[PDB]
Symmetry: C4
Subunit: 31 residues, 4 copies
């Protein structure tokens, strides 16, 4: 079942997107 | 149709590239 | 054997995750 | 030929790795 798509690929994309939420927030209060 | 390639993979690459544009800009005015 | 999954994909996810560990730590002592 | 592996996937991993080289350098001179 994981042959079609591995959880690492899905998690990787999710992790990167989540990072943007936190990094973007910091950019909002940039100095 | 999405079996060949999922939109998450394409979006992930696009999101990462876009992040660089914003992060790179900040690096330009580094201090 | 690498046809099923290339090491680049696995390494890419690992590299991104590792980056978060270092970047997250910096955010902890943010100023 | 690109069916086996798309250039976007390879480029994505390369782009992320390259980002670390620049981001890591900044961390070296952290303040
Ligand atoms: C489908 C097949 S391979 C495949 C795949 C995903 C990745 C990692 N992508 C990242 C995109 C952004 C966000 C994360 C760090 C890097 C920039 C690389 C995850 N590497 O390969 C997907």
């Amino acid at each position: 079942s994981n042959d079609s798509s591995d959880p690492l690929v899905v998690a990787a994309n999710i992790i990167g997107i989540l990072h943007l939420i936190l990094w973007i927030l910091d950019r909002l209060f940039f100095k």
